[PDB]
Amino acid sequence: GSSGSSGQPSPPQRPNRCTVCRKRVGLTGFMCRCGTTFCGSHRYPEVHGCTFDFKSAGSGPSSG
Ligand SMILES: [Zn+2]
Ligand SMILES: [Zn+2]
């Protein structure tokens, strides 16, 4: 059976999905400060209850 691959070469370049509704944000997506991506509608922190985790890491060299 002469085969090679079944599907399509579509690697995850810059795939982004709203952590609130997973609307696949991108065109106008907003990456919250906490470190997440949301939609223009869920871009606000209060909307997705921003849980910015601070002083929660004791490794690697510091910086500013
Ligand atoms: Zn959303
Ligand atoms: Zn946030």
Side-chain angles (χ1 to χ4, degrees):
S2 301
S3 285
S5 205
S6 64
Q8 53 200 348
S10 277
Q13 303 90 7
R14 206 77 188 160
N16 279 72
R17 292 198 278 202
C18 190
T19 317
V20 168
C21 65
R22 303 274 211 204
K23 75 148 267 92
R24 302 90 182 278
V25 297
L27 271 67
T28 195
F30 280 75
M31 186 156 231
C32 201
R33 60 180 286 188
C34 46
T36 45
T37 314
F38 305 101
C39 60
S41 200
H42 299 154
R43 71 176 274 277
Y44 294 103
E46 69 201 77
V47 177
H48 67 259
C50 200
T51 50
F52 189 102
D53 272 303
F54 48 104
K55 65 183 209 287
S56 281
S59 79
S62 282
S63 190

